[PDB]
Amino acid sequence: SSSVPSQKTYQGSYGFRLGFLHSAKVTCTYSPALNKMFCQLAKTCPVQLWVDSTPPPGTRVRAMAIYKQSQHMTEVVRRCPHHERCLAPPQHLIRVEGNLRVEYLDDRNTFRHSVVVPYEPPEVGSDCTTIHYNYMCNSSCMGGMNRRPILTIITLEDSSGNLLGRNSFEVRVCACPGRDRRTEEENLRKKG
Amino acid sequence: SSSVPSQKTYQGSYGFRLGFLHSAKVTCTYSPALNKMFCQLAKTCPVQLWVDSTPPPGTRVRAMAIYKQSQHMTEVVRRCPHHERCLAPPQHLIRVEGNLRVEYLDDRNTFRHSVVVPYEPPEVGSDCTTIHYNYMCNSSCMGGMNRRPILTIITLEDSSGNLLGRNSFEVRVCACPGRDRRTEEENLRKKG
DNA sequence: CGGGCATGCCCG
DNA sequence: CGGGCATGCCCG
Ligand SMILES: *C[C@@H]1C(=O)C2CCN1CC2
Ligand SMILES: *C[C@@H]1C(=O)C2CCN1CC2
Ligand SMILES: *C[C@@H]1C(=O)C2CCN1CC2
Ligand SMILES: *C[C@@H]1C(=O)C2CCN1CC2
Ligand SMILES: *C[C@H]1C(=O)C2CCN1CC2
Ligand SMILES: *C[C@H]1C(=O)C2CCN1CC2
Ligand SMILES: [Zn+2]
Numbered sequence: 001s002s003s004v005p006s007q008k009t010y011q012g013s014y015g016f017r018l019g020f021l022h023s024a025k026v027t028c029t030y031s032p033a034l035n036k037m038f039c040q041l042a043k044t045c046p047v048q049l050w051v052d053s054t055p056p057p058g059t060r061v062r063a064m065a066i067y068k069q070s071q072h073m074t075e076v077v078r079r080c081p082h083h084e085r086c087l088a089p090p091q092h093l094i095r096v097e098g099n100l101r102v103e104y105l106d107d108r109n110t111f112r113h114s115v116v117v118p119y120e121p122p123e124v125g126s127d128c129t130t131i132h133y134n135y136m137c138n139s140s141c142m143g144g145m146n147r148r149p150i151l152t153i154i155t156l157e158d159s160s161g162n163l164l165g166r167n168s169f170e171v172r173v174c175a176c177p178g179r180d181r182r183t184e185e186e187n188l189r190k191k192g
Numbered sequence: 193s194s195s196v197p198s199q200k201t202y203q204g205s206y207g208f209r210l211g212f213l214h215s216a217k218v219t220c221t222y223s224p225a226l227n228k229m230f231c232q233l234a235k236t237c238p239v240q241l242w243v244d245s246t247p248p249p250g251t252r253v254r255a256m257a258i259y260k261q262s263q264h265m266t267e268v269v270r271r272c273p274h275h276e277r278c279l280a281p282p283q284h285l286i287r288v289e290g291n292l293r294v295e296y297l298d299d300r301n302t303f304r305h306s307v308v309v310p311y312e313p314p315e316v317g318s319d320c321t322t323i324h325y326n327y328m329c330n331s332s333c334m335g336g337m338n339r340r341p342i343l344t345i346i347t348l349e350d351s352s353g354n355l356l357g358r359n360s361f362e363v364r365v366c367a368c369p370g371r372d373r374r375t376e377e378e379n380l381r382k383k384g
Numbered sequence: 385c386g387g388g389c390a391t392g393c394c395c396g
Numbered sequence: 397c398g399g400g401c402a403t404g405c406c407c408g
């Protein structure tokens with residue numbers, strides 16, 4: 001009955017976790033302390049998928065944004081009117097690049113947007129699979145996120161629709177990821 | 193042949209001038225030193241029309257915005273996509289309130305927007321006529337003015353289309369007119 | 385209300 | 397590139 005998707009971590013029977021590359025006032029940088037990606041608009045944000053056990057054939061990887069703060073959690077996250085007017089429907093915040101099987105979904109009941117690609121196991125000798133996401137507005141965009149923090153929820157789903165795993169990370173899309181990560185980490189240490 | 197309207201002051205044979213009320217970190221405030229109105233979005237910006245000689249019956253008062261800086265002067269000033277989506281067409285920046293004969297014009301050749309009302313002479317004992325303009329975006333709106341200063345051009349035109357007078361003033365539509373007027377006047381004194 | 389943060393962007 | 401302005405908005 002809820003129109004708010006779960007954000008609860010569920011690493012599940014396949015041992016699903018996300019990973020991030022190591023990254024200066026930079027196009028993206030991930031804070032482990034904050035579980036938060038800082039990235040620039042319309043630029044690559046790589047996300048690694050790690051599993052302990054191989055998901056079945058036909059597994060899918062879905063990404064969806066939700067507002068982090070309770071007061072905004074019921075509002076659908078969408079592209080702002082300016083960037084909408086500038087495969088992906090123009091209203092979608094999150095895109096996937098570099099994939100020939102990307103599907104964009106608008107839920108008929110919840111109106112939430114999501115982007116899905118097939119799960120592919122790592123190549124031999126590799127421990128993870130990387131997806132290249134793109135966020136098409138800044139967190140600050142007027143008429144869109146409007147300075148409200150979001151979480152990205154990554155779910156691993158079988159072809160039948162069973163939830164196999166779920167993880168999430170906060171995102172700030174901003175002009176100066178390195179500056180803003182340093183500011184937020186310092187604020188955590190000083191006032192958190 | 194130009195699609196850029198003239199901004200040259202022409203006080204003309206009727207002695208046409210504009211005047212502004214005297215106005216604190218306020219909903220509007222006018223700087224004589226800068227010839228610049230500082231006002232808030234979607235709030236009244238009164239403009240006084242002064243003449244030495246009475247214009248003929250059927251005279252009209254037109255207002256049009258143009259970008260002040262040479263680099264932007266050929267671009268039409270429009271409402272940003274966010275405020276457009278929130279009588280006046282939604283794309284028009286400048287509205288007139290309190291008038292039952294307001295006309296909104298989109299020029300078929302230049303694409304410029306303007307808003308026109310009939311000229312009315314002052315009531316007996318008064319020396320000026322006041323029009324209540326409204327600016328429907330901040331100067332800073334992304335996808336609209338985008339922090340570029342504008343001028344408002346006020347023309348007095350007869351019913352036949354003859355230009356009787358023209359005046360202009362700079363406008364900054366902003367959250368804190370009193371703060372910003374003080375900052376700009378101090379910068380003029382210190383660095384201008 | 386005024387002080388001061390915010391954050392995309394400017395300038396060196 | 398990094399320092400620091402910008403400017404709608406937050407908090408007291
Ligand atoms: C987004 C950034 C980059 O461009 C590389 C890969 C992931 N992060 C860290 C370095
Ligand atoms: C999971 C692995 C790694 O740790 C490196 C970068 C991404 N994949 C391929 C090699
Ligand atoms: C816009 C402001 C106001 O609200 C009054 C009239 C004109 N200015 C100065 C005071
Ligand atoms: C021009 C006149 C004035 O100076 C005051 C305010 C506006 N009109 C009416 C009275
Ligand atoms: C964050 C800051 C930088 O370091 C350059 C890119 C974006 N912004 C302006 C210059
Ligand atoms: C300009 C500043 C003020 O003084 C109040 C109105 C708008 N802004 C926030 C509070
Ligand atoms: Zn946007």
Ligand SMILES: [Zn+2]
Nearest residue numbers: 272275329333
């Ligand atoms: Zn606007």
